[PDB]
Design a protein around this ligand. Sequence first.
Ligand SMILES: Nc1ncnc2c1ncn2[C@@H]1O[C@H](COP(=O)(O)OP(=O)(O)OP(=O)(O)O)[C@@H](O)[C@H]1O
Ligand SMILES: [Mg+2]
Lengths: 99, 376, 172
Amino acid sequence: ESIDYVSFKEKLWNKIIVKNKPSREQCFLATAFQRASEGQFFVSPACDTGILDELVKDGIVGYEAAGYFITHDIYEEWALEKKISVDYIRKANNNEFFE
Amino acid sequence: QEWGQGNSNDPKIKIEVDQKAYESGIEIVWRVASFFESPFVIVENEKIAKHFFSLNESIFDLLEEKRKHTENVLYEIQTNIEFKDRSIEIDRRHCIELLHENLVQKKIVIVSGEGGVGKTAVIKKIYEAEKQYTPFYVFKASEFKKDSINELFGAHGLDDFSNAHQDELRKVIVVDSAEKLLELTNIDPFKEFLTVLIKDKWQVVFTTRNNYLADLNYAFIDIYKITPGNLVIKNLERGELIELSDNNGFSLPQDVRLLELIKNPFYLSEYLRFYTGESIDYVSFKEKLWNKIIVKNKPSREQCFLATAFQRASEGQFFVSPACDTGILDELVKDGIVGYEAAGYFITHDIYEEWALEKKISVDYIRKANNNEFFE
Amino acid sequence: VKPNWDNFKAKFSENPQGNFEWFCYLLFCQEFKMPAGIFRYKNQSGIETNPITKDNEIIGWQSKFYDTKLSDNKADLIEMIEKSKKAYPGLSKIIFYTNQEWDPKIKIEVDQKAYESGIEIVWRVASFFESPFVIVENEKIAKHFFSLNESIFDLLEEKRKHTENVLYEIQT
Ligand SMILES: Nc1ncnc2c1ncn2[C@@H]1O[C@H](COP(=O)(O)OP(=O)(O)OP(=O)(O)O)[C@@H](O)[C@H]1O
Ligand SMILES: [Mg+2]
């Protein structure tokens, strides 16, 4: 009488966002964090050649002349949680992590 | 041939041979040239008749061409290591029996593991046990770069080749190095290939590295509604390598980081290529591995690898984000030298990281203005 | 497919008579259910093969490809009828195939020669090849003789099976 939620989100992240390119995953994580950090709705990220245009043709990311934005709120939440996990793995101490 | 008109109209030689047949207790049924002109030969059995009456290629010729291809593909594959006039084999009979069992219970099997571990040699040992009794064909994943799948089968189609085996219950196709399918810009011919094979009830085997494993499992479960069998092949354990060393008569290296390398059968095969007088010619081994594995023929590969190793050693970090040229880390990940995870990139073997730092020190020594600047 | 004798004459210009005979042999074997063929002597006289037997009636066949109307050819038919009974005394029926068309007088004359011989003649003139027995039932045989580009009908099978392969993936 319930869904297996961790399996659902794992299949969706790998199939829709990553596909099979490491550059796509690094691009999407950077894009979500810059919005959450600067407070801006539209951003212009630093990325490898063609990755943002490819994400726009997938419909995952949207574009207007002011910059790029993320189409679905659920995917932006998943991205922020994964970025926190990465910084937890790479820390020297707790005070650095919270900075 | 045909008889000439002289049954009441028969010529004398025919009634003489017919008389001797009867006197021996036998009836003869005569099938002269007008038999081969009839619907039984010409319309019903046209695929057989075309072999003998035509100078064009035929279905027998197609099966011959594909068998030749299978023998050519497996020629280079090595199944043992040869050393001081003696042959060394790792026992694989457990894995081979598991594969025979899976093919009875299930339609599709995936064989998986890291590079150089022996996935294709197992397939070679299956083939040598079955080539006479059963249809068995091997295709490289490189071959599906075509506009149409029928380009692989000459003037015949895929459906013709499949129909030639319709009376066989056991029949196998192997797709080899499946992770190279990620290099194709058009995947539509391969999907049609699988659709025909699933409909006609072939058994199918894949060999793959670990990066493409989930994609294969998803595709069979989502589209064709099949749960495939999975098998994993691994490097040696330390006790197994000790017994190899004792039984076959070679001494193991003293360096812990080299001992971790030769647990993989490809690298053990290289180690025993430079061995003489109960020691190894270490300089030649080092030179061959650096130039053939890491550099190949690109300067940009060597520059990227040196920068990655030094960044790890400088920052005190296992995972890093290197500032490489725009496609080189992906090429090194496909080679299996560099690894990737969501936290960053890392280096797979320790011995290569030591060698990288030593070359970096040599370069900084060549370029220095004075000794204090070098140590800084 | 549709009957076209210009296509036939363009395809089989090195030997028209010999290919028309084979077209009739295949249709005869289909009509009288003799799928493994019939015995035949070299330079066989009167009729094209040895006779068959069915419900106590004995039957043979003959074919002719002509540029003339049949009225010009009466002597061949009289010769056919007389030369057959000389060789196969019990013969009851002959079936005759041709690309031509003729009720007219000459048919009555040749029928009388057959009648006095006691032999029945059945005529398969050009309108026979307009029949659905040729065109619709035995279509695979008819396609060989009347089509300039018979391989086009394989292409119309290849695209059809391609379409079935494409839609197998789709879930409703
Ligand atoms: N049973 C065995 N005993 C000893 N050495 C073996 C054995 N099987 C394989 N090897 C060695 O391992 C090497 C690599 O084998 P193989 O080509 O099958 O690897 P693989 O797993 O298919 O690799 P790849 O992923 O690169 O295609 C062989 O060239 C041979 O030297
Ligand atoms: Mg291999």
